[PDB]
Structures are given as structure tokens and as C-alpha cells.
Design a protein around this ligand. Structure first.
Ligand code: ADP
Ligand code: BEF
Ligand code: MG
Ligand code: ZN
Ligand code: ZN
Lengths: 207, 90, 135, 28, 411
């Protein structure tokens, strides 16, 4: 530093250096200015948002977009009320039981056929008929007591990780393109941007 | 994909003048009768007026929106509108 | 990296982060936010720099070159009593790739590699019969 | 007596033209 | 009928065939109906003339299958159409046994449903269902092609094993010891074929015109034009400018399926009217999501973390054994450079003392697993491990799904 500098003894924080063009002349924290598991770095809201984006990537059609609350409730047992309230997202729908396909499949295998009857009338036969006209939802499987709670425990927590959520470092590249050098965070949206064209494309809709 | 449509047909987003032609025409004839009864409105030159009025309005909403974000609030109260009227000069 | 800097924010030492510092850079077409990584803040605090001017910083070298004072508004820098090397105005983007060419005589290389600080001998003239192995 | 001809959705899309989706109850 | 019928039921496509054959019979497992209502069976989807706007439904969901109606009808279709599937012919299959492959994380109630539907309607005589994992150890029974790649360098069934499957639905990693797989160190990765296709849709939408209704094009593009980053994300990005592929829209008036071209090769100089989508970055960025899920901003750990933790659950004495013999299974593994990339990654993560080797079956692993199961049917240990009709009748459907093939029993 240049030797001999004048100070006024007020403030004078050697580790705090704030300089601007003085359009507001206000610190971002003057008076609280406002108004390694990944479950820790990303809060519950953030991990739930990642989860619902994951489930919305699961679907391959329009019809399963309203099926996302049902699928997520089947996954983690959350009522659809909070799914519709806090997630903040971005006859073919009701399973494959359409009778039209049921009678159309006859022309599929009509080239050769030789069916014969070999069946009885028992409780097992009744259950087979019930399964044939299945029309059941995963919600019905989970709400009912047809599956043991220990089975739920060993099907839900036999997959998740709990202590090590990351072993490789993150690249942290821009969202739009993959400019790997001179990456930087945006002024407002707080998402990494690399190129001028990337910033122009991001500032309109994503930011 | 579900984004590229919103990229290739959203390269041109314009928005248009909206105030309905027939209700506006009825209104202007109504306020023109008392000024001069049996005033025959020419069906031309009314689109230019109906663009100028909307232009002045959207100027008023942009000014009141600037005033609103100046008040850290998104809704519009009468106060913003009246002060926009006064500070513009009428 | 070149452009007009508009604001530096610097924090203290905290358990979550050793130093929470951010830099804002304005070009002729772009404004962007950079985050400092606990060392270069010593770079900008070694000499008293301040915002509202065009500076050049190298990613790998880490040197900060203050070229003077930006243009922004003419009045804000029209009463500084000359100085700032006839101010400046931002030209292009934030970061680019350029080529630096350095011209050096061979004798300068032998003097540089002869001693710990031979560039001083380039002016004092006390090289003193540099050995042949160096040559 | 046709000043009320300008409908409320007309005002709502007029506000939508100028930005900000916040609309009061007497801005119309 | 000594040789059974082997059915590898896949969520995307099922592989049905007699034990005699060396290659499976491939039949789709889905249902796509045109918007005008003329539905088409799974095998007949490929013969349709329009793929722009279809309504889809696949009986097998992420976990397993619930409604057996469509699966039963499709099983009869592949079991009662000798004309469409040549060579195969059957009347009832009374004396015919069954060899099936179903996941180890099946629902016990759904397992009971499957057992009852396979036995008490079609009138089988003997069954054996087990995950595709346990049969791969039987690769030592029969000679075959098996490319073993070293990570470090630049009875008959094998007791020591650790196998990964990656199909359309999801990914499963299993440790197998003493021929009895471990059911606690098993780890499931949700990234399957569905999720890769979804990522493909999103990234093309980030680059080129949308096709989200048209998912068959997404599946074809994923199977055709992708390749895994051979070394790293950044160095593969350095090849984005020099290396690029170009796909052409399939014009229903002209061609039901499109094609991919390389500008270097002049073997296809024919110009075309339709629009051409250039893929220069998404060829290699897409496969990277297994090692970097956070590219798509998910909280998912990753493949390497999953295998490391699964090894961590295993006992320390058996931990080094599994990595010394790893077999790659699944239709996702056919992507080029994937096996070498994952081998390099996990060998880098694993310490110096133990060297891990990955065995790749040449080509797709689906037919490899099918021929492995056919060999298992050939293998005589199946005779000692089989069950009969009287065992099913003397007990209830619950005993067969809770005692022999039950998963909590082997825990
Ligand atoms: N050569 C290939 N390149 C890329 N992807 C492939 C290739 N072959 C198959 N696939 C993908 O693998 C998936 C097949 O998975 P599959 O084995 O049917 O799973 P499951 O047995 O659970 O149904 C398909 O979605 C397909 O996109
Ligand atoms: F049923 Be698979 F191969 F996932
Ligand atoms: Mg399968
Ligand atoms: Zn970008
Ligand atoms: Zn932004």
C-alpha cells in the first residue's frame, strides 16, 4: 500500500472493504437487509423440488403430468395436497384396460389359433378373474394392508443413501451451454453463465 | 422436448392492441352526441385514435408500475395513478 | 478479463466461508458477478483500488492492472484534476484470449539465469564473467 | 350510458400488456 | 418336453423363446394408439406409418407390474401366434416348464399375483423365476465370448459375483455370494432408459425443435447417435466442434424413420427437403449424467457413490472379491465407451491394493442374459433346484412366494 494514509478512526474495518459508485450507498447487510450429505447442502424444499423434477422427467406423455402427485405419493407417502400446494412444478391415462384393445387383440393372433378349455370353478379361479380385470392403482396397493410394513421398510430404505451423497467433485457449468472456462454467476437469477449469447438467451425467460 | 418450442416460436412475442372495436366505437359516439348531436363518425381515422389512446394508457401503466416497484409492492392503489396524473402535468 | 467494475463487496472470516467476497463487472454490453476465492482480495487490498473504472485481470497470473477511470458519466470524472490517464471507456466483452510477445536479448537471458537477481545487474552492469555452462 | 362497455378482462389484459400480473379491485 | 420355455420379461421389450434356440424372440411390451382411436398391439407399433402424435401406455412401471391383463394377453400373443414368430409352435405347454427372470425387489403380493397368473390359468407343470443376476455366475458352465477389461492398466456357477443391470426401467446393483445374492447391499439407481430418454428430450429442447409428444423418435435417437465421454467432460467438449452428427426428420410421406449422417463421410450426398437437427454436444454430455446427475440439478448421488456404498455394506473379507469379477448387464450398457469409463472411474476411486476388472459380453447384454438363462435350463443344477405342480397344489400361493423365492428369506 502507499505509505502514509489518512483515516478518521470511524469504522475502519481492515477486513471489510466496500466500494461502489454510490447509487444507494447501502451495505447489503447494514441491518440484516431483507424485508456431507446433499440433504444438508440442499434444504428439504430443494431436495423435494429435485424429486418432483425427477418424477416429472419420469413421464413420457402429457397424461402422466397430473399423475405426478400420485406417483410421488406412492414413492414417499406424501398427500397430494402438499404436492399441489408446495411443489411448484413446471382411457389411456387410466392404465391399459380399454375394451377396444381387448377385442382388437383378436386380429393380432388370428393368423393361427387352437384354444382348448382346461379350467375349474374355485376361489383361486375367482381370484384369477379378479386379477384379469385388475384395474388397480399403486395407491390402492399401499393404502391397503396387503403388504407387510417390514416389506415397505425393506423396499423403501434399501435404495436410499444416508451418509455419502457425493464422491466426485461437481463441474458446475453453465445451464444453457457448456462453456467450461471463465464461468460466473448471474447478477439476479444466481445461475452460472459463460458466453454473451448464453446471457442474452438466459436473461429473458430463465432469469 | 418441452422447451425448444418456447424457443423457436417465442423468438417473436409482440402482444397487440386489445380494446374492443364495437364497444369503443359505441362509447365514443355516445360522448360525441352531447358535444354535437347527429355527429356522423367516419369509419376511417378511428384506428389511429384507438392506437393513440392505448399508447397513452400503456405509458400510464408503465409509469404506475415503476411507482409500484418503488413501493416494493406489485399491486396498484389509487395513489400511484393520481400522482402519475399530477407529476406528468395534467 | 476487462471491463468497468461497479462494486466490490468483502466479508469477514466465517466458519461457512473463509471470505465471502463478490465483484461486479460492467462491459459495454454485459454485467456479471464474480466470486473471490480467499486470495485475490489481498490483491485488490494490497493497493487502494476503487470501483467505477476499467481494470484488466489475468485468470492465471492474478495481476490487477488499473488502467485509470471509466467513462460512465462525464461529470463524475471531469473534476478530478486531469489524472487517470485521460480516463477510458469499456470497449468489448468481459473475457477474451490474447497473445503476449516478449522480446529479450540472449545476453539478458544469461544475466537473468546467472544470479538470484540478475535483472538488477542488467542496469548496474556487474555481471562478472558469466560461466559457460549457463550459456 | 355505455361507459361500462369496457369489460374487466379488457382492463386485466391491458395491465398484462404493461407487465406485472398484480391487479387491484378498483384499478378498472 | 424336457426343455422349458425361457421368458425374460422386460419393461420395454420382452424376450420369449424355447430353450433350444440360441437367440431370444423379441416382442415389444407397450401399447401405442393413434389419436384417431385405431390402437395397435405392441409388436405392431413398428409397422405404423405415423409417429408424430400417439398415446402411450406401458404395463411395466418403474417398480414392477400391477395389472396382469395386458401382460397375460401379450404372453398369450407370444405363446399362441406361431405364424408371426416363426419356428415356435405350441398347443398347451402342459409338460413344458417355465424359466422366468423377475426382479429381486418384487412386491410379495405382486409376486403372488405373478405366480398365480403363471400357474393356475395356463396350466404349467414346473416353474423357476429368479433375477437375471444369479444366472450370470453360470457363465462358467458354458463357453462364450467375454471381454475382461482391467481397471488399473491403461459348482459351475461362480459364487463370487457383483452384477449391475441397466435397462429401460431403472438400474440395479446386486452382490452375489455362494450363489446366494446379498439382499441388503443391493442398490437401485433410478436412471433407466426412461430417464435417459427424458434427459434427451430436455437437452434437445435446449438445442433443437421439440418432440415431447414424439417419444419413439427420442428412443431411436438415444439408441443410435449417442456415445459416452471416453476420457472426461471437458476433453469431450473439446471434440464438440470437430465431431458432430446430423439427424434428419422422418417424413411420413417419404420415410417413416430418419437417418444420421457425418459431414466427414460423403457416402450420403443426397440433399433432402426436410429440416436437419445438428447434435454436436449432446452426444457425450447425455451419458455423463450417470457420473454427474447434478448436471440436471438432481440430489441423486451417482453411480460411483452407489457402488462404493454398496461395497461398504458388504463384509470386509468379501469386499475385495466382488470387484475382481464384474459382469456388465443391461441394454443401456451398449452405449460405446461406457464400460471403460465406469471401470476407470471406480478403479480411480477404489484404493491401490485391489484391482477391479469389468467383464463385457460383446454386443447387447439382453441376448447374453437370455442365452445364459437357456444354458441354465441346460444346466442340470436347475433339475435339483426346480419345483413341481404338486408342491404348488399341496400348499397355497403364499408359501411359494414367501419361502423358496421370497426375498426376506434370503436376507
Ligand atoms: N445400442 C444401444 N445404445 C443406446 N441405448 C440402447 C442400446 N440398446 C438398447 N438401448 C436402450 O436400452 C433400453 C432397453 O432396456 P430393457 O433391457 O428393455 O429394460 P427392461 O429389461 O427392464 O425392460 C431401451 O430403452 C433402449 O433405449
Ligand atoms: F427387466 Be430389465 F432388464 F430391467
Ligand atoms: Mg428385463
Ligand atoms: Zn450457456
Ligand atoms: Zn440470471
Amino acid at each position: 500500500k502507499a505509505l502514509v494514509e489518512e483515516i478518521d478512526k470511524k469504522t475502519y474495518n481492515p477486513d471489510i472493504y466496500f466500494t461502489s459508485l454510490d447509487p444507494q450507498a447501502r451495505r447489503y447487510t447494514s441491518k440484516k437487509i431483507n424485508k456431507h450429505s446433499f440433504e444438508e447442502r440442499y434444504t428439504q424444499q430443494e431436495i423435494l423440488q429435485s424429486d418432483r423434477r425427477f418424477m416429472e422427467l419420469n413421464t413420457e406423455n402429457f397424461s402422466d403430468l397430473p399423475n405426478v402427485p400420485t406417483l410421488l405419493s406412492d414413492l414417499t407417502g406424501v398427500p397430494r395436497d402438499r404436492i399441489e400446494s408446495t411443489t411448484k412444478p413446471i382411457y389411456g391415462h387410466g392404465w391399459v384396460l380399454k375394451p377396444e384393445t381387448l377385442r382388437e387383440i383378436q386380429l393380432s393372433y388370428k393368423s393361427t389359433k387352437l384354444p382348448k378349455p382346461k379350467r375349474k370353478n374355485t376361489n383361486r379361479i375367482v381370484a384369477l378373474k379378479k386379477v384379469l380385470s385388475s384395474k388397480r392403482n399403486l395407491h390402492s396397493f399401499l393404502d391397503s394392508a396387503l403388504l407387510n410394513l417390514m416389506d415397505k421398510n425393506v423396499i423403501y430404505h434399501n435404495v436410499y443413501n444416508k451418509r455419502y451423497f457425493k464422491v466426485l467433485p461437481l463441474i458446475t457449468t453453465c445451464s444453457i451451454c457448456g462453456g467450461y472456462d471463465s464461468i460466473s454467476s448471474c447478477v439476479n437469477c444466481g445461475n452460472k453463465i459463460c458466453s454473451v449469447s448464453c446471457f442474452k438467451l438466459h436473461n429473458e425467460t430463465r432469469c | 422436448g418441452t422447451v425448444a418450442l418456447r424457443e423457436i416460436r417465442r423468438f417473436q412475442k409482440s402482444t397487440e392492441l386489445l380494446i374492443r372495436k364495437l364497444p369503443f366505437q359505441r362509447l365514443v359516439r355516445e360522448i360525441a352526441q352531447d358535444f354535437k348531436t347527429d355527429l356522423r363518425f367516419q369509419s376511417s381515422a378511428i384506428g389511429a385514435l384507438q392506437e393513440s389512446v392505448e399508447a397513452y394508457l400503456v405509458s400510464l401503466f408503465e409509469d404506475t408500475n415503476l411507482a409500484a416497484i418503488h413501493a416494493k409492492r406489485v399491486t396498484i392503489m389509487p395513489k400511484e395513478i393520481q400522482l402519475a396524473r399530477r407529476l406528468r402535468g395534467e | 478479463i476487462e471491463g468497468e467494475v461497479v462494486e466490490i463487496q468483502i466479508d469477514r472470516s466465517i466458519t461457512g466461508g473463509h471470505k465471502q467476497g463478490k465483484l461486479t463487472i460492467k462491459t459495454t454490453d454485459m454485467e456479471t458477478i464474480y466470486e473471490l476465492g480467499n486470495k485475490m482480495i489481498d490483491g485488490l487490498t494490497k493497493e487502494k483500488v476503487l470501483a467505477g473504472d476499467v481494470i484488466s485481470i489475468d485468470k492465471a497470473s492474478g495481476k490487477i492492472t488499473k488502467l485509470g477511470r471509466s467513462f460512465a458519466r462525464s461529470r463524475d470524472y471531469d473534476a478530478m484534476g486531469a489524472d487517470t490517464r485521460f480516463v477510458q471507456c469499456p470497449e468489448g466483452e468481459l473475457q477474451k484470449r490474447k497473445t503476449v510477445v516478449h522480446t529479450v536479448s540472449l545476453h539478458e537471458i544469461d544475466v537473468i539465469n546467472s544470479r538470484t537477481q540478475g535483472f538488477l545487474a542488467l542496469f548496474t552492469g556487474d555481471t562478472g564473467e558469466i560461466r559457460s555452462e549457463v550459456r | 350510458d355505455n361507459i361500462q362497455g369496457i369489460t374487466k378482462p379488457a382492463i386485466r389484459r391491458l395491465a398484462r400488456r404493461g407487465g406485472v400480473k398484480r391487479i387491484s379491485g378498483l384499478i378498472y | 418336453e424336457t426343455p422349458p420355455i425361457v421368458i425374460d420379461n422386460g419393461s420395454y421389450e420382452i424376450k420369449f423363446g424355447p430353450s433350444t434356440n440360441k437367440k431370444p424372440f423379441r416382442a415389444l411390451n407397450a401399447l401405442a394408439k393413434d389419436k384417431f382411436g385405431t390402437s395397435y398391439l405392441s409388436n405392431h407399433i413398428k409397422n405404423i406409418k405415423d409417429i408424430s402424435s400417439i398415446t402411450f401406455r406401458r404395463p411395466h412401471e418403474l417398480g414392477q407390474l400391477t395389472l396382469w391383463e395386458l401382460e397375460s394377453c401379450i404372453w398369450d400373443y407370444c405363446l399362441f401366434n406361431p405364424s408371426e414368430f416363426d419356428g415356435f409352435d405350441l398347443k398347451e405347454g402342459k409338460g413344458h416348464h417355465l424359466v422366468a427372470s423377475e426382479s429381486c425387489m418384487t412386491l410379495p403380493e405382486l409376486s403372488k399375483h405373478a405366480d398365480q397368473v403363471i400357474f393356475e390359468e395356463y396350466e404349467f407343470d414346473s416353474l423357476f423365476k429368479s433375477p437375471v443376476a444369479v444366472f450370470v455366475p453360470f457363465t462358467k458352465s458354458y463357453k462364450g465370448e467375454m471381454r475382461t477389461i482391467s481397471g488399473k492398466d491403461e459348482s459351475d456357477y461362480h459364487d463370487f459375483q457383483l452384477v449391475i443391470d441397466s435397462g429401460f426401467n431403472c438400474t440395479w446393483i446386486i452382490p452375489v455370494l455362494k450363489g446366494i445374492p446379498y439382499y441388503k447391499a443391493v442398490k437401485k439407481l433410478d436412471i433407466g432408459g426412461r430417464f435417459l430418454t427424458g434427459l434427451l428430450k430436455e437437452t434437445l429442447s435446449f438445442r433443437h425443435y421439440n418432440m415431447m409428444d414424439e417419444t419413439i423418435l427420442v428412443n431411436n435417437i438415444k439408441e443410435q447417435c449417442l456415445f459416452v465421454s471416453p476420457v472426461s467432460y471437458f476433453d469431450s467438449f473439446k471434440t464438440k466442434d470437430k465431431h458432430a452428427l446430423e439427424y434428419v426428420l422422418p417424413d411420413f410421406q417419404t420415410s417413416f424413420l430418419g437417418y444420421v449422417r457425418n459431414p466427414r463421410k460423403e457416402n450420403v450426398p443426397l440433399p433432402e427437403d426436410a429440416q436437419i437437427i445438428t447434435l454436436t454436444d449432446e452426444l457425450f454430455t447425455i451419458p455423463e449424467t450417470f457420473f454427474h446427475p447434478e448436471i440436471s440439478q438432481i440430489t441423486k448421488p451417482g453411480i460411483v457413490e452407489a457402488i462404493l456404498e454398496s461395497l461398504s455394506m458388504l463384509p470386509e473379507i468379501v469386499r475385495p472379491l466382488m470387484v475382481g469379477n464384474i459382469v456388465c448387464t443391461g441394454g443401456n450398457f451398449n452405449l460405446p465407451n461406457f464400460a471403460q469409463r465406469l471401470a476407470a472411474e471406480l478403479q480411480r476411486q477404489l484404493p491401490t491394493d485391489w484391482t477391479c476388472h469389468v467383464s463385457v459380453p460383446e454386443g447387447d447384454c439382453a441376448l447374453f442374459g437370455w442365452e445364459v438363462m437357456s444354458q441354465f435350463a441346460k444346466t442340470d443344477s436347475y433339475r435339483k433346484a426346480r419345483v413341481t405342480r404338486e408342491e404348488y397344489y399341496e400348499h397355497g400361493p403364499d408359501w411359494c412366494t414367501k419361502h423358496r423365492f421370497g426375498y426376506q428369506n434370503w436376507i
